[PDB]
Design a protein around this ligand. Sequence first.
Ligand code: ZWD
Length: 494
Amino acid sequence: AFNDLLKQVGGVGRFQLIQVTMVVAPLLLMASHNTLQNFTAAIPPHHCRPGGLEAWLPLDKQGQPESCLRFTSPQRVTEPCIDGWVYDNSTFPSTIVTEWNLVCSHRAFRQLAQSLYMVGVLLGAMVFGYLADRLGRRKVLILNYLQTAVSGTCAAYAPNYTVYCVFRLLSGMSLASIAINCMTLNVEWMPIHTRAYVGTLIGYVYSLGQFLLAGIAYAVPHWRHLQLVVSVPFFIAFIYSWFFIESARWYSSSGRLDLTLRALQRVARINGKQEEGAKLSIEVLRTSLQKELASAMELLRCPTLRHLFLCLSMLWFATSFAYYGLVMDLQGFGVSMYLIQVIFGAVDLPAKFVCFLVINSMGRRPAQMASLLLAGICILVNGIIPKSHTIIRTSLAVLGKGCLASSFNCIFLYTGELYPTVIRQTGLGMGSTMARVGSIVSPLVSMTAEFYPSMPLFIFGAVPVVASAVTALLPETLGQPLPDTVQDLKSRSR
Ligand SMILES: Nc1ccc(C(=O)NCC(=O)O)cc1
C-alpha cells in the first residue's frame, strides 16, 4: 500500500502544510471569478439620451423615467434609444453593461457571458481532467494558473463583447481545472484520515473568497480594474507553482518508480525524515505497491446502478442550478450588493453547522430532503413577496443560500456513500458534471426575466422541490457499511 509509505515520510509535516496552503490559496479568488458578473456587469439606472430632460423621457407605471424609450418630440410618440443611453455613474461608474450597452434589447448578452463562462468551466473539468492522467497534476496546475492569469487580464482589456466572452470561457476552463486538481493533488499527498479535512478546508476557503469578492469590488468599482485585480494574482500563483512537488501516487501509478522515490526523498528532506526516507528504495516501493498496481458506461447497462445514477444526477443538477440562479441576482434585493455578498459569505458557516448536525442525527436522506425543500420554498416565497420588502426578501434569499450550501455538502457525502467502490469515483465525477451542467443552464433560465419578471425565481425554486421529492427514492446509508460491488448493492436493496 501507499499509506504506510506516506506515513513513514512524516505524515502531515512542513511540506504538506506549505503545499496545501499554496495550492489552496487560489480558491480565494475562485469565488470572485465565479460570481464576478454581479459587480463587473451591474446594471445602473439608465434612459435614452435626448422642457427639460423630464419632458423627453416617457413615464412608466412606477413613475420612473422609461429605461429604453424616448419622446420623439417635446411634450406623444416613443422611440428606442438610437442616440444611446444615459447611465448613472453615482454608484457604478463603468460596467460591461455601460461599456457595451448590454441593456434592454441586448440584456440577454449579460446572461450569455455567464453561461459561456460556465460552459468553459465544464469543458475544463472534462479536458484537463483527462490531461492530468497524462501530464500529471503539477504540470496541469502550472498551465491552469498561466491560462487563468492570461485570460483574466485579456478579458479586463477586452475591446469588444465577443473577445470578453472568449477569454471568460477560457478563464473558466482554467479555474475549473484548478479546482478539480487542487483537491486531487492534496488528497494524493495526504494520508487517508485527512482527506475529509482537506475537503472541509476547501469549503472554508470558498466561503472566505465570498468575503474577498465583496471587499475587492467595494475597493475598486470600475469593471476593467476589478477584473484585472482579481485576475493578476494568478500570475504570482503560476510563478510559485513551479516549486510544487508532484504527487508520488501518480508517479507510482504511471510506472515511474524512480520518480516516486525521488519525490518521497524530497518530501522526507522537507519534513525532516531523511533517515526514514533513505530506507525507501525501488524494491521496497515495488513490493509495497504490487497489490495496488469500472467504466462509466456500465452506469446505464446495469439497472441497479442506473437508478442510482439517474436520481443522483437529478439531485446534483437541481442543487447547482438553484444555487447559481439564486446567487447571481444580488442586485434584485433592494439592498447594497456589498452587504448582500458579505451576508451570503457569512451564512455559509451556520449552514454547514446545521447540515452536520442533521446528517449525524437524522440521516442523509432527511438532510437532503430538508435542504432542497427549504431552499425551494424560500426561493418561491421570495418570488411571491413584493419587491418593495427589501429586508424580508433579503432574509429569505440568505436562508435559501444557506440551505443550498447545506444541500451541496449533503449531496457530496450521500453520493460518496451510495455507490459501490468499484464505480464510486466515476459516480462522483458524473454527479459533479451534472452540477456543472446546472450551473451552465441557470443563466439561460434567468434570461427569461425579460418577458416574465418573476419566472426565473419560480423555476429556481421549483426545481429543488422536485429534486427533494426524488430524494425519497434513494436508500439510507447512515449506519451502514460502504458497498464494494454491485452484489453489495443488490444485498442492500433487498
Ligand atoms: N458553494 C459551492 C458551490 C459549488 C460547489 C461545487 O463543487 N460545484 C461543482 C461544479 O460546478 O464545479 C461547491 C460549493
